[PDB]
Tab-separated table of C-alpha atoms and ligand atoms in Angstrom:
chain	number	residue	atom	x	y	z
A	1	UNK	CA	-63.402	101.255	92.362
A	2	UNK	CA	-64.146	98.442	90.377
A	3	UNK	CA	-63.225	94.992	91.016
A	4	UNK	CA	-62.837	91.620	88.899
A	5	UNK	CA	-65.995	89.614	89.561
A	6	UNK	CA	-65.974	86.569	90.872
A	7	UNK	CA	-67.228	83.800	88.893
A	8	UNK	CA	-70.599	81.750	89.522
A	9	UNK	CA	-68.369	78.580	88.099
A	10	UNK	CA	-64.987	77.351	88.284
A	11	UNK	CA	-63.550	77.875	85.022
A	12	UNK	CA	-63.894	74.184	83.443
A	13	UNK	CA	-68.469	74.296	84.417
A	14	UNK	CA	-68.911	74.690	80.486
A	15	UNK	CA	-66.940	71.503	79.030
A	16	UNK	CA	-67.650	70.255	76.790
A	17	UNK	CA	-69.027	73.554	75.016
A	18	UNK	CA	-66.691	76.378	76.002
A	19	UNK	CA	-62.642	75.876	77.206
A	20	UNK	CA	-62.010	75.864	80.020
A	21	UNK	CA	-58.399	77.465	79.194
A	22	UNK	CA	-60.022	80.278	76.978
A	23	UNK	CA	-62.495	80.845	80.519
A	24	UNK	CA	-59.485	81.688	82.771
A	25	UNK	CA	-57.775	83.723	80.229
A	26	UNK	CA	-60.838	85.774	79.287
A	27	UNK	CA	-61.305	86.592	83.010
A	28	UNK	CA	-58.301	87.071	84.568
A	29	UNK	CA	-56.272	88.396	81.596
A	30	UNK	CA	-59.142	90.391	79.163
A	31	UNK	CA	-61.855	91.579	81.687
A	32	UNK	CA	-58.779	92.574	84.348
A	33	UNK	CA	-57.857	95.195	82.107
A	34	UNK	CA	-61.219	96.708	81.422
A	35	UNK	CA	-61.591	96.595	84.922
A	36	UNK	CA	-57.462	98.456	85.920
A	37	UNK	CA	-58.317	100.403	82.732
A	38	UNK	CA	-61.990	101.703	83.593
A	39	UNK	CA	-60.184	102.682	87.333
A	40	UNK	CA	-57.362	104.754	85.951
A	41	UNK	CA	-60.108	106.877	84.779
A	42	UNK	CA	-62.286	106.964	87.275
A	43	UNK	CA	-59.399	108.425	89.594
A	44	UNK	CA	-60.119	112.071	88.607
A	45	UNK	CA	-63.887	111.598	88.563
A	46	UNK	CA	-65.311	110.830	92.311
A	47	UNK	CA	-68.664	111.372	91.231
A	48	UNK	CA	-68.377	108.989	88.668
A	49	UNK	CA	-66.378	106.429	90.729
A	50	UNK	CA	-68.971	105.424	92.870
A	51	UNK	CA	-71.545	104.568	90.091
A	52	UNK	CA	-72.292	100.507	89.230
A	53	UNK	CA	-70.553	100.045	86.145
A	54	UNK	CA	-74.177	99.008	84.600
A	55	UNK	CA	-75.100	102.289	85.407
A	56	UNK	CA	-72.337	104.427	84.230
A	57	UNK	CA	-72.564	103.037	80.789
A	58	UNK	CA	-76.582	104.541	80.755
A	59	UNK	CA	-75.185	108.210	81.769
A	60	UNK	CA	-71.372	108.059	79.500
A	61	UNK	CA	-73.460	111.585	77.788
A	62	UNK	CA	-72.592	112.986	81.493
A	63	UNK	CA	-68.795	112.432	81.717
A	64	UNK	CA	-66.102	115.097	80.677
A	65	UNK	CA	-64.858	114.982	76.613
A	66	UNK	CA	-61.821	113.613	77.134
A	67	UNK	CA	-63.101	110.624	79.153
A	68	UNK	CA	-65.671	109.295	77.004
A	69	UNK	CA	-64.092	107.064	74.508
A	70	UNK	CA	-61.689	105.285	77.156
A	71	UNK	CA	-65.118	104.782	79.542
A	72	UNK	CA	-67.116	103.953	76.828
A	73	UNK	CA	-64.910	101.081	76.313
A	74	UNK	CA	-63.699	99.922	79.341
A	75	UNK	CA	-66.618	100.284	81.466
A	76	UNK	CA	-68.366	98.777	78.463
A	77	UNK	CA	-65.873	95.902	78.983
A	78	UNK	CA	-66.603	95.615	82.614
A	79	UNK	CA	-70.122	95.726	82.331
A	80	UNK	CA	-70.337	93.193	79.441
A	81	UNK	CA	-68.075	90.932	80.957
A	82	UNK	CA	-69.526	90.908	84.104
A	83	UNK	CA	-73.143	90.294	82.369
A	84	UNK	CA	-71.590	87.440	80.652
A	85	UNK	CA	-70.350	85.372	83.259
A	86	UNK	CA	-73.616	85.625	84.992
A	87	UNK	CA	-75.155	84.724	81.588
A	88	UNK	CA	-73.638	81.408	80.865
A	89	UNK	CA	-74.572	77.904	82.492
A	90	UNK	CA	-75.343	74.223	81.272
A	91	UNK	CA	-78.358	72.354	81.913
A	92	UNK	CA	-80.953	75.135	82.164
A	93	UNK	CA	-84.264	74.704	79.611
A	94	UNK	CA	-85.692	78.247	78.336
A	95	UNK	CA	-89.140	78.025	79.389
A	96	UNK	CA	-92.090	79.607	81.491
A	97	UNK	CA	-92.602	83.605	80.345
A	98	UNK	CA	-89.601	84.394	78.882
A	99	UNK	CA	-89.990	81.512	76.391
A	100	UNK	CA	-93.712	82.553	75.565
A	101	UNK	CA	-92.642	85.986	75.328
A	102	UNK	CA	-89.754	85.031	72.788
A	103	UNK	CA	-92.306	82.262	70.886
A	104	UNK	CA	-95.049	86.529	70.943
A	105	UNK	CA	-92.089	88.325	68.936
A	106	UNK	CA	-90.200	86.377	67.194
A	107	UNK	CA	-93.106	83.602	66.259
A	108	UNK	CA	-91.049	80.598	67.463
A	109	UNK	CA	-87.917	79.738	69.503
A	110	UNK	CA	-86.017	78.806	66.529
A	111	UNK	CA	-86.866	81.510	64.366
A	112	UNK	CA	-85.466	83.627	67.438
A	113	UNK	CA	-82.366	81.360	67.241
A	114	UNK	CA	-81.844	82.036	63.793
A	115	UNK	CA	-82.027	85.746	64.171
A	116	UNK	CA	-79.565	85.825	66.870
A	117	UNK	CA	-77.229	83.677	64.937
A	118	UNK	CA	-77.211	85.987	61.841
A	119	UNK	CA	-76.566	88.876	64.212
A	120	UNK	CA	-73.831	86.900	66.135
A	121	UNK	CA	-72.209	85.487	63.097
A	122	UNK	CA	-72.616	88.996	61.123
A	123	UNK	CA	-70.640	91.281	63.222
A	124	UNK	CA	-67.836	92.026	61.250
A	125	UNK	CA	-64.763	92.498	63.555
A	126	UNK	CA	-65.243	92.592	67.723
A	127	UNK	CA	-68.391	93.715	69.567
A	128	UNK	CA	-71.366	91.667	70.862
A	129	UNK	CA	-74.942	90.020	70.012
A	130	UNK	CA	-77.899	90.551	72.049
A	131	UNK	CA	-81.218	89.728	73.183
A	132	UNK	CA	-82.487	92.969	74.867
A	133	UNK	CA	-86.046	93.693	75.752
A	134	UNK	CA	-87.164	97.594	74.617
A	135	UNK	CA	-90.228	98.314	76.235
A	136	UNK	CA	-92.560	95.649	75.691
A	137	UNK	CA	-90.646	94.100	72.757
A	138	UNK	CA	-87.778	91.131	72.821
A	139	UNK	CA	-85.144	91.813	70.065
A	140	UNK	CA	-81.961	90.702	68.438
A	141	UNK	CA	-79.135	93.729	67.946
A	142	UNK	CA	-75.667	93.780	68.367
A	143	UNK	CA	-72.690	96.175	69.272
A	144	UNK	CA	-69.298	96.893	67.744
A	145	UNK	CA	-66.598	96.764	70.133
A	146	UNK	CA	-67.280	96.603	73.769
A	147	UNK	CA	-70.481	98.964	73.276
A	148	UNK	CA	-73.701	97.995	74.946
A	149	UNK	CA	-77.189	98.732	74.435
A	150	UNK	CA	-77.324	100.278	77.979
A	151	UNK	CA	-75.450	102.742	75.743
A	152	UNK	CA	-78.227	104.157	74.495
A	153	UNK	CA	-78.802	104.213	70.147
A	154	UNK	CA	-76.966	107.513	69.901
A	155	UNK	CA	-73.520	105.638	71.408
A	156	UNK	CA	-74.074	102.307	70.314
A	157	UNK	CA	-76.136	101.858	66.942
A	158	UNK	CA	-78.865	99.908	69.819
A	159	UNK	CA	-80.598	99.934	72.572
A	160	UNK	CA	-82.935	98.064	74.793
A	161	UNK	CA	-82.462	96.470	78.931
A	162	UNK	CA	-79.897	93.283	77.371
A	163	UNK	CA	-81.988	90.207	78.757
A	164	UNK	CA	-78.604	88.070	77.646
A	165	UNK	CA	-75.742	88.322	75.128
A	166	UNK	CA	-72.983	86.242	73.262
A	167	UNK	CA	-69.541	88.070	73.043
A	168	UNK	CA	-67.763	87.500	69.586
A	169	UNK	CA	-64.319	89.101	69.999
A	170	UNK	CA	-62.077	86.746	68.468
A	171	UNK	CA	-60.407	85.483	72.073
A	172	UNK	CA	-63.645	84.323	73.105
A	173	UNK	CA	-63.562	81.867	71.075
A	174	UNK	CA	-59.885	81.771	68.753
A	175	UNK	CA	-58.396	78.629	70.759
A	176	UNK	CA	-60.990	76.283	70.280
A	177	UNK	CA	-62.978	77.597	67.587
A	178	UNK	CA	-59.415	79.391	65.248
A	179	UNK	CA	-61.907	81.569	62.768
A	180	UNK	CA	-64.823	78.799	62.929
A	181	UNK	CA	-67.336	81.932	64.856
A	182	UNK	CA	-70.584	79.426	63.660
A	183	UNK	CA	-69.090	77.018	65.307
A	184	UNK	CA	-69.271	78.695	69.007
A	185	UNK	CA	-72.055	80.270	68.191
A	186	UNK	CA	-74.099	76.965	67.757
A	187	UNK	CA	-71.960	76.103	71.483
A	188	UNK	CA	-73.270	79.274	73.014
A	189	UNK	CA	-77.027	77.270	72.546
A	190	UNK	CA	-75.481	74.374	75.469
A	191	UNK	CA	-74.471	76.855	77.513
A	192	UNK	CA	-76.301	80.503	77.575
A	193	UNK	CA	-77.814	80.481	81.298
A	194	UNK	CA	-81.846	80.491	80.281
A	195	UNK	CA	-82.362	80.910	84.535
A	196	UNK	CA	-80.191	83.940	84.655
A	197	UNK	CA	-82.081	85.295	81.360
A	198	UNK	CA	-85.338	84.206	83.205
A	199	UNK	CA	-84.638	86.299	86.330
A	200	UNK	CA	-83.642	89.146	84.368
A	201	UNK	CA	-87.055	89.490	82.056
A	202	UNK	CA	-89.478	88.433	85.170
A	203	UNK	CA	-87.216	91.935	86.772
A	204	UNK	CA	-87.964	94.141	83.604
A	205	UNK	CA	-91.040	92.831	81.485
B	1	UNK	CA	-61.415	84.640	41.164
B	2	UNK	CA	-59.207	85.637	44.351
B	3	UNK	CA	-56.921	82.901	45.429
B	4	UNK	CA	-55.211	82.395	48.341
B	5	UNK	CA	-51.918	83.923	47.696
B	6	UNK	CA	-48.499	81.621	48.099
B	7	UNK	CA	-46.399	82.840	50.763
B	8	UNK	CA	-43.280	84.581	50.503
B	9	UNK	CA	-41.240	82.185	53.213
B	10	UNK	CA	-42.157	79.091	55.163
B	11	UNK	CA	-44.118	79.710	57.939
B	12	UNK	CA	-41.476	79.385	60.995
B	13	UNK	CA	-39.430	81.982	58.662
B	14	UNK	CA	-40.151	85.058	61.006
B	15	UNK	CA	-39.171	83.220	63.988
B	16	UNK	CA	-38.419	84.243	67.203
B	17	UNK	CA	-40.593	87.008	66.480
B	18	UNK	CA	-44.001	85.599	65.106
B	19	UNK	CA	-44.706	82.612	65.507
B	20	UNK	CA	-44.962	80.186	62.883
B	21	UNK	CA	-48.413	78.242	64.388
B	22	UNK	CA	-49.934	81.404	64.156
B	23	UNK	CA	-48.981	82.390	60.703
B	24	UNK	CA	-49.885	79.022	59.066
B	25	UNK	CA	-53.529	79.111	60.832
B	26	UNK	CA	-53.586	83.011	60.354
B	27	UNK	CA	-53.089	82.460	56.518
B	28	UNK	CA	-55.164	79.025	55.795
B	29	UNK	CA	-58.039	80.045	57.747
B	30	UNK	CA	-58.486	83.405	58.299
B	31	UNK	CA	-56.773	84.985	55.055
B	32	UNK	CA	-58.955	81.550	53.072
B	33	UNK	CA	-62.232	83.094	54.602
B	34	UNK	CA	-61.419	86.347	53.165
B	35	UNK	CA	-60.919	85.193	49.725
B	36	UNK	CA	-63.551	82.911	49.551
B	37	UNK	CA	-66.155	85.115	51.224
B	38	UNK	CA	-65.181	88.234	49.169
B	39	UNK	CA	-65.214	85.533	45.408
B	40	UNK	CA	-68.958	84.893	46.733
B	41	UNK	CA	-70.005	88.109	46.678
B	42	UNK	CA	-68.500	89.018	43.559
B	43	UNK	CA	-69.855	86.201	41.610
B	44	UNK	CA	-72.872	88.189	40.336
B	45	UNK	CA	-70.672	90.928	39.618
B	46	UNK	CA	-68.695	90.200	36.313
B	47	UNK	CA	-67.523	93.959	35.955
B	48	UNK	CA	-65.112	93.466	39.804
B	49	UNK	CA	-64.745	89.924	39.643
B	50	UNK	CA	-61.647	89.749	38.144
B	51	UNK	CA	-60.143	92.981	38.801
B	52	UNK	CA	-57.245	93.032	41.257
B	53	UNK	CA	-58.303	93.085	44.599
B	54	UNK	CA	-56.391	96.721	45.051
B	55	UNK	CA	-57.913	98.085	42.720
B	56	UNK	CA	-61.626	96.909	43.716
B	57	UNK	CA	-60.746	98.714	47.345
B	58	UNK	CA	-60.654	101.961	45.256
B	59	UNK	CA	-63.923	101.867	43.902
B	60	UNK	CA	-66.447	100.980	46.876
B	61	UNK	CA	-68.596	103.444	45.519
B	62	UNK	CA	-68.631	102.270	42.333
B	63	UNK	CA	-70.930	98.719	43.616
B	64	UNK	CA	-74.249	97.874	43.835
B	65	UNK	CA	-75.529	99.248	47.713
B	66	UNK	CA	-76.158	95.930	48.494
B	67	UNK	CA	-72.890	94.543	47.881
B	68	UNK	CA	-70.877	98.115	49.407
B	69	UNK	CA	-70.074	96.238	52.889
B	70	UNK	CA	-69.605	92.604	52.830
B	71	UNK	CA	-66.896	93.847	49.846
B	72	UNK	CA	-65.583	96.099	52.103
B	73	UNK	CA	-65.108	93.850	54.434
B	74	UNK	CA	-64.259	91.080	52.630
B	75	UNK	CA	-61.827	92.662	49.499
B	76	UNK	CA	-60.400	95.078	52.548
B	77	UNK	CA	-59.302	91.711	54.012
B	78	UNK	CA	-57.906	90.054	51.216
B	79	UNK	CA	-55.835	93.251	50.427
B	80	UNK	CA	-54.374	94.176	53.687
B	81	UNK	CA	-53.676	90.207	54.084
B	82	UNK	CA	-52.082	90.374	50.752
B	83	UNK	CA	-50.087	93.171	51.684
B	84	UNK	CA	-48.746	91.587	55.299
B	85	UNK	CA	-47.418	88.837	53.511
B	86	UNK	CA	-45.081	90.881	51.170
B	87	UNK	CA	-44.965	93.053	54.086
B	88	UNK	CA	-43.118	90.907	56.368
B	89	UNK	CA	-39.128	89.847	55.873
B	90	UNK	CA	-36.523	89.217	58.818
B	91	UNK	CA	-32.945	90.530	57.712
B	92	UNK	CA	-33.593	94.081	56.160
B	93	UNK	CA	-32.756	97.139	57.660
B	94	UNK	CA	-34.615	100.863	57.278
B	95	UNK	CA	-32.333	102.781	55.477
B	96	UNK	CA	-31.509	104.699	51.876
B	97	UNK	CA	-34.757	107.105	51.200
B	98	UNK	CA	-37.162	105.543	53.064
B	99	UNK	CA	-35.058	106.166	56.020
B	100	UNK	CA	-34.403	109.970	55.119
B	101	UNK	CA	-38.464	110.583	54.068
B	102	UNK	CA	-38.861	108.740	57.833
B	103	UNK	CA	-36.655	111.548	59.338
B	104	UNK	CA	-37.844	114.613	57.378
B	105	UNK	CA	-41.639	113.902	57.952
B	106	UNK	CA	-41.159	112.392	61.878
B	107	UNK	CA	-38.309	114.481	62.762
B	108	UNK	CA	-36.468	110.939	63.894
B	109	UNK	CA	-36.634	107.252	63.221
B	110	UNK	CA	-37.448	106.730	66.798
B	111	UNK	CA	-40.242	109.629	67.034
B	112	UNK	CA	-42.096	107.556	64.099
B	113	UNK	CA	-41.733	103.845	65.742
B	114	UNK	CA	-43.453	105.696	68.919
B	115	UNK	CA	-46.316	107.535	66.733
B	116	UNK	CA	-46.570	104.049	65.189
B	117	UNK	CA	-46.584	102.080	67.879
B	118	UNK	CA	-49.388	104.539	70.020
B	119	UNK	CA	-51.697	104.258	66.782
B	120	UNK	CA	-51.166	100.575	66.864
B	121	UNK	CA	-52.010	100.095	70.781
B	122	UNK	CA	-54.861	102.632	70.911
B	123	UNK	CA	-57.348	101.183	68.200
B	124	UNK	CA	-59.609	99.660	70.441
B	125	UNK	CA	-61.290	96.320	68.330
B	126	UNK	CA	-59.995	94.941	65.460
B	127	UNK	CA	-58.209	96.650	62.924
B	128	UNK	CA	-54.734	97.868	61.476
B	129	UNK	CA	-52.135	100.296	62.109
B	130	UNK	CA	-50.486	101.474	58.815
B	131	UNK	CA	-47.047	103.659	57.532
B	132	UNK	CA	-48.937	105.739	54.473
B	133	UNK	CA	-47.919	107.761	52.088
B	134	UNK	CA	-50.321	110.747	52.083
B	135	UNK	CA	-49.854	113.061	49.570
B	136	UNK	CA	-46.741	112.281	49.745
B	137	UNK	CA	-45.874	112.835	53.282
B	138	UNK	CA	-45.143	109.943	55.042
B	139	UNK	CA	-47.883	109.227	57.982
B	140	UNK	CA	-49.197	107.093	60.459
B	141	UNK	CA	-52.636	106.148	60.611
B	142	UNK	CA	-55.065	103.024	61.734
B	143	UNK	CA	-58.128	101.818	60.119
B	144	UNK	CA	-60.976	99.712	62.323
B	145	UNK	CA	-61.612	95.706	61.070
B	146	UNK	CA	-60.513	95.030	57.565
B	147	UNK	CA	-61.019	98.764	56.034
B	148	UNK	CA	-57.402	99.910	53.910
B	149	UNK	CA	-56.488	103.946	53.737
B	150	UNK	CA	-56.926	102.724	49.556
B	151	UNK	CA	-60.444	103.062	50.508
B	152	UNK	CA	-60.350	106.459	51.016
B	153	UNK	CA	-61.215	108.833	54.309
B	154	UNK	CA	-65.257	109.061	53.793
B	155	UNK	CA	-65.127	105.154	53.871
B	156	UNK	CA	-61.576	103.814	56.037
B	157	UNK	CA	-61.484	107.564	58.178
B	158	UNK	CA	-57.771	107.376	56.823
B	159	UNK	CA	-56.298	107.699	53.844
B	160	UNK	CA	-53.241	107.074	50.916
B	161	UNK	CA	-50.847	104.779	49.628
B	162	UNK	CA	-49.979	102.162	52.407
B	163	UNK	CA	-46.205	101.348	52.562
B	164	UNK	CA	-46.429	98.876	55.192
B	165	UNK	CA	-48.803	97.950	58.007
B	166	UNK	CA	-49.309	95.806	61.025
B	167	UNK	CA	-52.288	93.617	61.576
B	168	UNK	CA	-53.648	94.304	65.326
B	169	UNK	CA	-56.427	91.811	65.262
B	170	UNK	CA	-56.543	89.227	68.255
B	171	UNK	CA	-56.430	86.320	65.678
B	172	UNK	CA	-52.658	87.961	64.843
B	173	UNK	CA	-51.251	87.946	68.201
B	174	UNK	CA	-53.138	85.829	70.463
B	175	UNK	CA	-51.163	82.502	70.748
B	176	UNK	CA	-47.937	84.168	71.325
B	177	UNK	CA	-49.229	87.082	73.133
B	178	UNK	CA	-52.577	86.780	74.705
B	179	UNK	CA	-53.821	90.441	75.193
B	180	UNK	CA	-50.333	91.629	75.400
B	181	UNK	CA	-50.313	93.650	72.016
B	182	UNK	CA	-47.252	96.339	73.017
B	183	UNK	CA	-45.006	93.355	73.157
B	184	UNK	CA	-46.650	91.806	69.880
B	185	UNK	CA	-46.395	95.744	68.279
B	186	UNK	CA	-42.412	95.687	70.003
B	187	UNK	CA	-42.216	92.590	67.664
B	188	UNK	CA	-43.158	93.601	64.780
B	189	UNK	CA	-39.881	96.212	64.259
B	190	UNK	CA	-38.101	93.049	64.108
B	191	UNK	CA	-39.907	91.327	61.035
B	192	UNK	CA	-41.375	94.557	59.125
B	193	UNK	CA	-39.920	94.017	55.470
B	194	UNK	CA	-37.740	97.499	55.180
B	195	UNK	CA	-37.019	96.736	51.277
B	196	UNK	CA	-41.033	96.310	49.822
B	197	UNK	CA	-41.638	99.458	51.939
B	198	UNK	CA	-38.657	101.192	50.105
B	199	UNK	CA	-39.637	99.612	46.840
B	200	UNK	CA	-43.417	100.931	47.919
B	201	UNK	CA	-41.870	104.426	48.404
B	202	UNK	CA	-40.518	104.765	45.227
B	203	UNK	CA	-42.974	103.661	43.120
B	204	UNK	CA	-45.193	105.671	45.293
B	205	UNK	CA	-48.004	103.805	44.068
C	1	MN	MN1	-64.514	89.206	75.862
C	2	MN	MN1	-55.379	89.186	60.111
């Protein structure tokens, strides 16, 4: 089955930018039941058990009707989650290939930041922003709900390998932030994990 | 211009049940946003500026394109806030016609708090579970983010003349509840306001 990741951080590593209350919450409450969730319906599908959860979100066109929706959604929530955690860390400086690479399609590191803001700040209700790579391209796209570009464009409204992403359902960020979403967006810039993002684009560029 | 409506009670006034903290930050930030956003947008549009906001939800179709979804979005919120508020009263009881329309169209009073409280836990993201009156059968139905069964089906995927609804956003239930909504939606029974939903019914519009 699927298990409740452990974390690369205790839960207070991103003070001053990101509660440290809102961090064990988010894990232990939210992601645990994507996770208990995603198993109760994997127990009538073996062959679907077995899958990483990064993977079963790529093949959700494969699963019986009556399973897709509550997959879609908690696997999705698994598999964001689990990408997010990895994703987040202070002190790291975006740099080396994946920086020139970002400076090649967007023009400039801040015109990339402003694109992912707008996307961040203009989902309307829950879901996600992203920086995926598709192909040879780095772009900005978001996801309603706990939808992923693994998803595939016919699912999700996007698409692409997600190099990083910033979730924006309201507990990620309702404690400290109330309805101020620009507000931890602007945070997420102290804190999203440039090394992890690094590792990620040298795997798939 | 929209304003921020004036509550009907002080905000500790649906005590034990919601909690006043929530309602005072739920209504000065989060209903505020919603007015202001939605007065922005309609600032170039003298012909739905200073309609009523429930009657602007009707005509969605009626709008420039380019002004279709942030209105939406933003007049959907400022209705179905509206609407909570007036919606909301400890000390009233369901009975008289609303009661016997309850029975005739659920079979039981208990058979529609469980069809209303399954719509309410299973929409997955933000959104709203609502008591409508749909050609004039009483029904339950749930709209995603801020979308109102006044917008129609093509638009909301739902459709007539709400009678009273529950707000299942996180913002809503999160400081009392964490990701607990059953026992937020178990809550809610205890605060719904039973005489606007009657006076609702019997306008019927
Ligand atoms: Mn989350
Ligand atoms: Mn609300």
């Amino acid at each position: 089955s699927y298990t409740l990741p452990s974390l690369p951080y205790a839960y207070d590593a991103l003070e001053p930018h990101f509660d440290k209350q809102t961090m064990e919450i988010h894990h232990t409450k939210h992601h645990q039941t994507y996770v208990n969730n995603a198993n109760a319906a994997l127990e009538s599908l073996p062959e679907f058990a077995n899958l990483p959860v990064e993977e079963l979100i790529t093949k959700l066109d494969q699963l019986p009707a009556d399973k897709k929706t509550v997959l879609r959604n908690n696997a999705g929530g698994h598999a964001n989650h689990s990408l997010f955690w990895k994703g987040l860390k202070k002190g790291t400086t975006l740099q080396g290939d994946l920086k020139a690479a970002i400076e090649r399609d967007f023009g400039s590191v801040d015109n990339f930041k402003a694109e992912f803001e707008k996307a961040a700040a203009s989902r309307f209700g829950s879901g996600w922003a992203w920086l995926v790579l598709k192909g040879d391209k780095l772009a900005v796209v978001s996801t309603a709900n706990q939808d992923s570009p693994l998803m595939g464009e016919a699912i999700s409204g996007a698409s692409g390998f997600p190099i990083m992403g910033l979730d924006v359902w309201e507990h990620a960020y309702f404690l400290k932030f109330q309805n101020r979403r620009p507000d931890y967006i602007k945070e997420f810039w102290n804190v999203v994990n440039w090394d992890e993002a690094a590792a990620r684009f040298a795997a798939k560029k």
